[PDB]
Every structure is written in structure tokens, then in C-alpha cells.
Write a protein that binds this ligand. Sequence first.
Ligand SMILES: [Mg+2]
Ligand SMILES: [Mg+2]
Ligand SMILES: [Mg+2]
Ligand SMILES: [Mg+2]
Ligand SMILES: [Mg+2]
Ligand SMILES: [Mg+2]
Ligand SMILES: [Mg+2]
Ligand SMILES: [Mg+2]
Ligand SMILES: [Mg+2]
Ligand SMILES: [Mg+2]
Ligand SMILES: [Mg+2]
Ligand SMILES: [Mg+2]
Ligand SMILES: [Zn+2]
Lengths: 99, 206, 92, 60, 82, 128, 155, 118, 25
Amino acid sequence: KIRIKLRGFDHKTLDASAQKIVEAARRSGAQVSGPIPLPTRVRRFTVIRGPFKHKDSREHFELRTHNRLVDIINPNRKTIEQLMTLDLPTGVEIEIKTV
Amino acid sequence: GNKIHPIGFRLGITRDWESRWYAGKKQYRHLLLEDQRIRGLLEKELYSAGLARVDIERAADNVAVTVHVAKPGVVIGRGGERIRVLREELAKLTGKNVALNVQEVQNPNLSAPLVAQRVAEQIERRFAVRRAIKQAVQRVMESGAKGAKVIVSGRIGGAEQARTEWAAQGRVPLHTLRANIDYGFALARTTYGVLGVKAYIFLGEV
Amino acid sequence: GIKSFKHKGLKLLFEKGVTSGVPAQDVDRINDRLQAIDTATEIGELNRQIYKLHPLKGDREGYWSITVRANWRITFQFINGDAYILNYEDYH
Amino acid sequence: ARKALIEKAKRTPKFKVRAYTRCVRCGRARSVYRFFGLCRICLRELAHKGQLPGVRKASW
Amino acid sequence: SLKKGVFVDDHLLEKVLELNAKGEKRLIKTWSRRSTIVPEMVGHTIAVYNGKQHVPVYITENMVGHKLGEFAPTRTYRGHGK
Amino acid sequence: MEQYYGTGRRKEAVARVFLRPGNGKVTVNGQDFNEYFQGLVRAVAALEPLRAVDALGHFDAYITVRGGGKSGQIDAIKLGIARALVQYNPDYRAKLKPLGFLTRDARVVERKKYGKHKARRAPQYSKR
Amino acid sequence: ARRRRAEVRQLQPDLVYGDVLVTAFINKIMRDGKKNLAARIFYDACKIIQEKTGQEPLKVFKQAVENVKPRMEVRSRRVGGANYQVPMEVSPRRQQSLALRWLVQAANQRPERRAAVRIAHELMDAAEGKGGAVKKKEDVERMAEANRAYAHYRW
Amino acid sequence: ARIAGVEIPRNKRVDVALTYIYGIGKARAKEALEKTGINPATRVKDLTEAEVVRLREYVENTWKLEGELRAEVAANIKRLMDIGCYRGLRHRRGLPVRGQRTRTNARTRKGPRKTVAG
Amino acid sequence: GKGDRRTRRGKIWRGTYGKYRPRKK
RNA sequence: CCGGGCACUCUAACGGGACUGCCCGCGAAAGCGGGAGGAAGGAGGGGACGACGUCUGGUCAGCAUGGCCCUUACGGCCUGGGCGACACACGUGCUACAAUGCCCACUACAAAGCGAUGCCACCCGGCAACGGGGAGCUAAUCGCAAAAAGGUGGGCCCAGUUCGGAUUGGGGUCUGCAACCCGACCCCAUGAAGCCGGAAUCGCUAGUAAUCGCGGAUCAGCCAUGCCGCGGUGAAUACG
RNA sequence: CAAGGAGGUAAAAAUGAAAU
Ligand SMILES: [Mg+2]
Ligand SMILES: [Mg+2]
Ligand SMILES: [Mg+2]
Ligand SMILES: [Mg+2]
Ligand SMILES: [Mg+2]
Ligand SMILES: [Mg+2]
Ligand SMILES: [Mg+2]
Ligand SMILES: [Mg+2]
Ligand SMILES: [Mg+2]
Ligand SMILES: [Mg+2]
Ligand SMILES: [Mg+2]
Ligand SMILES: [Mg+2]
Ligand SMILES: [Zn+2]
């Protein structure tokens, strides 16, 4: 019933921090749908390489925003207990909602 | 010439970020401006420390700020000032958790920003630049470096004629990705103008 | 007499007296050459030693060029007692 | 007109259409990205610095 | 092309209406084409600014959607060598 | 009714090919292998690996397709049909190689590169 | 400087025929990369061949190409600011290419209204040895004929 | 059939033949024959005289067309004669009315090039 | 007629819709 | 669409996968040719990556900065004008001169991206632009979008013509304090030049050229036919 | 199988550029 979403710019921190919550939910009495890899939202932009006025030949950058989903079954305060405030991100945004 | 910033050229693999936080739109713009104003405010009254980095991390009103310094001499024991209101003056336009840490950069002769900054000081001391370059390189090479390279360009020793002094010992492969190459830069302000100091420090990888 | 300007700085200096188009130390220099190019009834008069006068070559044929200072040239076309296309150009 | 001109860019009153974007790091009025609030010049500088969270070189 | 607005300058009209009761003098300026021809005060002259000076334009019916400054060219041209 | 693998891809096109051992030479997806591919000459070339083998309608085709346009889909179907008959007939390998019906064909649309007008077409100039 | 001799490109055989030639012809018909319209026109014209003559288009088209084949062509070469025109032999690859190219071009040169009827007729005319392409072929061989003088320059 | 001021178009579809009148174009064309109730794909070759009469009576009336509306259009430009606006001066000088680019182009009103050279 | 504002083709090219190109169904 | 299942497809995270390693021939070696080996090969196809230096190259109008100069002003505010001027000349382009074509109707098949101070389903008015409503969507959920070339049907029949769309009159809509100078669309009517281009001149060697539409940045709006990306169909030729 | 010596030698294609 409990749905958690984890967005992030770094994939290595995401693929690891959203895997901790798979271990911290499985070893507390619940069935956990593993790291669901939602598609990425790549936000590119292309900037002229020079401060002057050399239109041809520039250089572009991208801001990949990754999405990862995980669902746990029963909202028992046994699994809730651990995933309550035992948070270890580096700024990774987490969404917790039940529906 | 034309060569890409050896830091940006890595970023992903080798050399991580310097401001590590995540946000969507309507927030990124505000938090980046604040973030940059922290870097701007710190650099001023903390230059005497000579800061190699200014790492920043966030987590909803958490704002962690790690200041790497060769010699953290300007911290002086708890209530001995140089930290108290100093790490608290940040929250005069922030008001968030101003968690300011201090790191001890062990060898300053292996920190590119510090190397270039030491050189740029010497330019303003009216030192002989070519000899200053040579020494700084060997100094870096003396402290165990796998390769080094310092570059001062323009208006050397005053004198109407922009020059470019060049020195580099050992190995500095900029094209390679598994490089671990530290890059630093510094503005030397002189009574006759402005000149830039590049500093490249290289260690192994694989 | 001068009749046309290709340089906006020179043009303002001679017309309105606006010196914010030229170098500040070259205001008196640029003035006394323009006036001499103005009172000139023939190119022969623009022949004083300090100007280093001389017609250009190649695609710049028909053009003249007195020297203001350094590598800076006042280039123009002199025809029928008048100068045209007055330009303050670096000789490159 | 540059100092009094980066004033108006933040002042923003009097008719809603007279308000415009403006790089914060610089004072550039052109090529100002809404996402960063920066000009294309500054954005490139900081992206190479590493001071742009997540922002990375694009190769494909 | 407006439809539910169809506007004239309030300040142009203020000056134009309070000088319209039982008659007036043609001495009346402006600084905005922005307005519109305005019926009533047709037998009037509106010195419109063209960027340089105030051109006395005259109203004699015939004009409507043409605000003002169309009766106040801003450029000169006049000829191209010929 | 039945199943036989199916993974044919060509230039951003995905086709899952099944075939069910029955004399009814049939179709899939929208309408007929015709109908859905009518007016298209090269559409019927996807069934060439069946001609390469001894299949004059021995299977009931079932290919769900997606992505790309018709031609790529048709190409992908060819790769899927072949991928089926090579799967449940491992000895039918000695015809998918000489005839070359088994290749993903990495030939895909090349990226728009800056400066150039499109892929490789240079923007054209005059010196003067 | 052509270090590689540029290997000969190979095509896909068509539908119903299996030609290693017809598809090459359909390609020349093709404009803007629309093989659908291109192939249709040819097969359309194939249906048109059946009407005006009781012959199978696979031979009518085949023989037409054979009749619009340049035995030898003129080649401009060396010494004198490239002043000479040595009449050279034509490679089977080039006879191939010229035949199909001249066919389609002469076909669209015809005053007819539909592309199919132009193709069909130009093929029938060429199969006989009458087509405007056959003119082009015979013309190119005239040029090659008149240059036998310094043909011994060869190469 | 001498419909308005013209008669020319014979064997060529009435929805098309109608177009050959200054005032008809394409929209008023099918609009006129659906309102008159006549088959658009007809021969135009003098078909049922009745359909032709009804068509003529409706078309030639209703809206202004041919030489009459050419006169009105020319008179609408004559509006900006007097002491007219800016748009009138553009009709005076012979230059484009809608304020476009005249540095190059604008040949459809200026006319073919004259070339000054200097 | 990619530039004629009275075609489904010109309306495509221009982007906008209208009478000569309705917003589907 | 549900029950349920997730093997297929897809999503994105680490991996495996050729190193001419194996066969024949050549060679002193490097290597080269050829052949089963497989999805793939003798740098697989594309990216990012640009040596010492050169051009007194470019950039004081992104920014920093030495020197010179201006300070009731070369600074500051405002309304208006101008950057959009046009006898002409050149560059890069867009749309065409048509029938492998145009118009109308029906009917398919993409990718890469953007959106809750917005994208706006579905209804209602309206020829339409658009306006009234109003559901869903913090978005592999809802929406932008039906991709277009294609196919099927039907109509023009080669004539400046159902080609071509400029220019101009009129009537409207939307943003905006306001669109005269100078905004984009919508509708009516006009329908020009052009029937394929002189001397010259450009691009591209395989998903390539050509051709077709789609997205995004900037952005109230837009003069975008531009630029940066996406996929659809898909040639020709290389003797030398 | 490894060249020493003898001989027929390209055309149409001119100029310089603006302080050391
Ligand atoms: Mg360009
Ligand atoms: Mg393409
Ligand atoms: Mg204009
Ligand atoms: Mg011209
Ligand atoms: Mg490399
Ligand atoms: Mg220079
Ligand atoms: Mg400056
Ligand atoms: Mg301009
Ligand atoms: Mg004509
Ligand atoms: Mg014609
Ligand atoms: Mg190539
Ligand atoms: Mg001479
Ligand atoms: Zn900036």
C-alpha cells in the first residue's frame, strides 16, 4: 500500500540508496517490489562555445533526472519503524504516499 | 590553443562535483544563487586560509558546507572566535542550517588551487616569474607528484609585451579520462594589469 | 573641404566637437589634420612631413592616408578639392 | 548604462511586460536561461567548474 | 486590432474633453499615437510627436481607426540621390 | 494457441513473431498481412525466409509490431520470422547464414551534428 | 587518391521477378526516396507492356537495356591542358549504369502524360532499337568513332 | 454564358468557371451554387438555361463584383488621398503598405531593379 | 502549396489550424 | 478493462561480447589477402577529446582588468522616435515554376523532448482564428499530437492554368498598458513574378545525399523560413 | 637477373599592399 519514489541526478547514489530501502523493508516483515527503474527525464541545453560570436561549433550539456520506484505491502509499524526516520541520502528527494 | 577545462572534462568518472544537491525547477535557480553567494562570501574573509575547495550539500533546509584548507589556522579553538558568528553570518540571507565544517588539506603542494594561488601571490610580490614557476613545479614534484605543469600568461614582469611562461616536469596527460588531474587558477592583480596562473597536478589512476 | 565620413568617431569630432569617438590624447592631433584636410584645395597641400602622406594600392586604389600617430591612419578619397569617406582606421 | 541597467532588471514594476530576464552572475540580457537564471557564458564557466549540480558534458 | 477594449489615452481624453464644453482653442498637443481618432472635437488640431517635433495634424471626418501618428511620419527619406 | 520466440528489430522497430503450426497462412495486429501493408510493394519481402525454407503456409503468423514506420517494421518482421524458425529448428541455421536473414542491421539514423545543416550536409559558402 | 578500389554495391532482388537489375532500374525511377511510387510505376508499365504486345516484360525490359549499351565511349585525357579525347572501352558496370540512366531520362523526355506509359513505351522502342535512349547510345558511339585517330594513346 | 461582366469559361466545371470573375474566387464559388442549388461538376457548356439564369441572377446581385468593386477598391485607396495617413503615402510612393523590409525585396511593388552603381 | 494559407498542407507548414484544416474530427 | 501473471516488448543498473584470438596463403617481423566463426568484426558505425605553436586572428559591448578621458556631466530617470529607413549590390535561405503533380475525403505507421504562476482531454458557440465551460496531470498515469511523406477513393488534364503564391482591399481574433511607424494567426476577394535559371558557384561516398514531418531552447506575444535535436521513406557513383 | 653514360623537357598566366 505504501508507495515510495526516489528522484536523483546521480544514478550511482540512487541505485544504491534506493536499494538500502529494499533490504531495510524485506528484513522487517514485508514483500517489496524491487528497484523499479522509471525512465529518465533528460534536460539538455546547447551553448555557444565562445564568449565572442563563433556560431558554428559549440558545446552542449545535459541534466539527467532519474526516477526510481519501490512498493511495500502491509503498512505495519514494524517496517515503518525502520523506514520512518532512518534516512541516508545525499540530497536525493524522496516521496512517500499511500493509496 | 583551445583546450577543455580538465575538471569539466571529468566530472562524471574521476573528479566528482562541488555542489551536490537535487531540486526540480522553481527551486534550482534560487538555491544556486544562494549557493554561489556562499562561495562568494566565503572566498573573501577566508582567503588567508587558502581554501582548496568549498563543497556544498543540501537536504531541505540542511545546507552543509565543507571548507578544505591547507592550514585551518583561522578557526582557533571553539569560542576563540574565527568560526562563531563567522559560520553564523551565512544565515543573514539564508536562515537555514548553516552547518560549516573545516577540512585539513594535508599537502598543499599537491593541491592545484593552492599551488596557483601561491604563485599568483609571488607575482604581486614582484618576484621573478620564470624562477617562481620552476620552483613551484619542483616543489609540487618534490612532494610525490606524478606530474605537474604551471602556466602564467600575459604582461610578465610588467613590460609592454604580453608573454607566456611555461614549465612542466614529469607526466601530464590531459586527454586521458582516468587521469586524476587537479586544476587550479588564480588572478594576480598588479599595478600594470592582470595575469592568469594555471596549475595542473597529476597522479595515477586506472 | 570634407564632404563625407565613413568613421562615426571622426565625423562627430569634426561636426559637433564630440571627442568621445577618438583617443583622448589624439584629440588635438586628429583635429589639426582634419582641418588641414578640410582647407586642402589639392592633395599637394596635405604633404607636410608629419602626415606621411601616400596613396594606397590594390583594392584600396584611389584612397589616400595621412598618419595620426603610431599605426593609425586617416584614410580618404580626395577629388576636386574635397575629401570623402574619411575613415580613422588601423593600417591593418 | 550597465549598473543602473541591472537595477531595472530586478526592480520590475510598472506594466508586467516591461520586466525581463537578466543573468545574475553577469549582467547579460541575452541568451539568459530561465532554468539557471544565467547567461550562456556564465553557465558554461560554472559547468566546467563543477559548481552546477548534476550538470555534465553531453556525449552521444 | 482590439474589439472589446478599443482604447484611447485617458490623459489625451482628459485634456480633450474638459476642453470641449461649448468650444475651445486648437492649441492641444499629445505624445502618443497610441490613442484613436476620437469623434467629437473633429474640427480640431492635435500636435502629434513624431520623435523630433509636434506636427499639427488636422481632423476632418474621414479618419477613425487611424489613431494619430499615422498622420505623423517619423522618417523623412525624400529621395535617394535623385 | 502456441508460441515460438520472436524478436525482430530494425531501425527502431520491434516485432514479436510467433507462428502456430497450421495450414492457415494468416495475419496479425490490425488486419491482414495484406490490408495493413497494402500498396506497399516491398512489404511481402518479410515472408521470404519462409520461402527460403519449406513453409508454403505451414504456420499461423502472429506478429505484434511497434515503433518506426512500415518498412522498418517489415524488416523487423523478417528478422523475427527467421528468429522463430531457427529456434524450434536448430538445423535451419545453415540457411539463415548464407542467405543472411539473421542480422539486426545496425543501420540507424545518424545524429544531427552542430554546424552542419543536417547530419553531414555542410551549410554551403562563398569566399567573397 | 582512392587507396581502396571501392567495392561494388549490391542490391536487394525485387518482388515476383528476382532480377539483380530491375531494382536498379526502379531506383533510377525513384525520386526523393519514394521506392513505393517508383516500384509501382515500373510494375504499372509492365502491365502496359502486356497490352500493346504479347511479350513478358522481363525480356522486353532486358533486351531494351541490351540495346542501350555503349560499347565504347569517349574519354578526355592528357597532354595539352587535357586537350585529347581518347575513345575508351566501357566496363560492364558502366554499360549497366548508363543503360538504365539513359532509359529513365529519355522516358521522362517523352511527351506522354503518365510516367508509366512513358516507361513502357520507351522500353518497347528501346527493345526494337528505336528509343530516344538508343539515340543517346548511338550518339555516344559516334563520338567514340570519330576519335580513333589518337585512340592509340589508349591507357 | 455572360454571367457577370464575363462569359469566357466554357467546358470547365462551374465551380471552377465561376472563379474566372473578379469577386468570386473559390469560397463564394461553391457557396453560390449550393445556395442556387446547382451541380458543381457540370459542363459549364451552356447547360440547362434555367440553372444559368438562377445562377446569374443570384451571383450578379447579392454581393459586388467585377468592374464595380474594382472601382470601390480603387476608391478605398483614394480614401487616403486628401490629407491622408501613413498608409496612403505608401500607396503614393509605390512602396509596400504593410511595414515590411524594403532594404531588399519588395520588388512586387517597386518593380524590376534599376541599379544605381557607386 | 506549402505557403498557401488555404490548404491542409500550408496550414501544416504554418503550424496553425482553421477552416482549411480543422482540429481533427 | 478486470482477475491474475510478468515469460515476451519496453524501461535503466551493472555485465558478458573479438582481442584478425581460430583455418589457408604471403612475410624476417610488423602486417596484408582470403575463409567457415557469430548480431557484430582486421580502429563495427557515430560522439566527447584539438600537440609544440601560428595568425600583433577574435573578443575592453558577457565578464575581470593596466592606462587615458567624462563628472550639475560621455552619468540618471521618463514619453516619443530609431535599430524595421530603400535608387541600388552581395551572402545564407524559404516557397515555387507542376501530372514520379496539385486539391478534397478517408485511413495508418515514429522517435526524441516539453508541461499543474502551465500542457489543457471532452462538451458548447463559431465558416474559422478563437471564446465559454471544464475533467485529468506534481506527470514511462493526464495533456501537448492527429506525426507527415505513405495508402484507399474521387476530382482537375497540362493551359500561367484547381500550378504558383506575392501584392493589395475589406472583415475579424489573440497576446499586451498599448500592436501607426513594427506582432502572429483566421476569413472573404484579389491573384503578381516565375514554364526551371548567364559567366560562374556549393553540398554529400551508406541510413549517407535527397525528401517528409515532430520536438525543444529563447519566449506575454512574435516577424523562426533561423539555430540545436528527433525519427519516417530512402538513391546514384567511385575506372582512376 | 643489377644501369652507367647519351637526347627529346612545362605552359598562357604579369604585379604587391600601405609603422620598425
Ligand atoms: Mg551558420
Ligand atoms: Mg533525416
Ligand atoms: Mg520596414
Ligand atoms: Mg538579385
Ligand atoms: Mg585520443
Ligand atoms: Mg589586430
Ligand atoms: Mg569594460
Ligand atoms: Mg539590426
Ligand atoms: Mg510571365
Ligand atoms: Mg508549363
Ligand atoms: Mg567521406
Ligand atoms: Mg607595374
Ligand atoms: Zn552572465
